[PDB]
């Protein structure tokens, strides 16, 4: 449920590449992997395809 994800703090960058933001809940996947790390402000852009 992405309702809680939206209900968390306002996001500086919330960009969806493969899965549409609208269809996030609609689409289903076998496994989900979340990678958590702390990076500087200008390093945010480097985390992208």
């Amino acid at each position: 449920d992405y309702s809680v994800i939206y209900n968390f703090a306002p996001f500086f960058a919330f960009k969806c590449y493969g899965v549409s933001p609208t269809k996030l809940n609609d689409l289903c996947f076998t496994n989900v992997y979340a990678d958590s790390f702390v990076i500087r402000g200008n390093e945010v852009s480097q985390i992208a395809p």
């Binding site: 309702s3 939206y6 209900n7 306002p10 996001f11 919330f14 933001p21 609208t22």
Partner: protein, 49 residues
């Protein structure tokens, strides 16, 4: 629906809170811009239909 035209830009309210006509968290302008350059590959080059 088939053969329809929409030109009005309302800030997309994907979130649970009204956007109030401004951009921000969970508030994105629906319109997005193609960028066309001579060096782009076939498949991203502008095609007139």
């Amino acid at each position: 629906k088939p053969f329809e035209r929409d030109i009005s830009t309302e800030i997309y309210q994907a979130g649970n809170k009204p956007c109030n006509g401004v951009a921000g968290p969970n508030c994105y302008s629906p319109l997005q811009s193609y960028g066309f350059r001579p060096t782009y590959g076939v498949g991203h080059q502008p095609y007139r239909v």
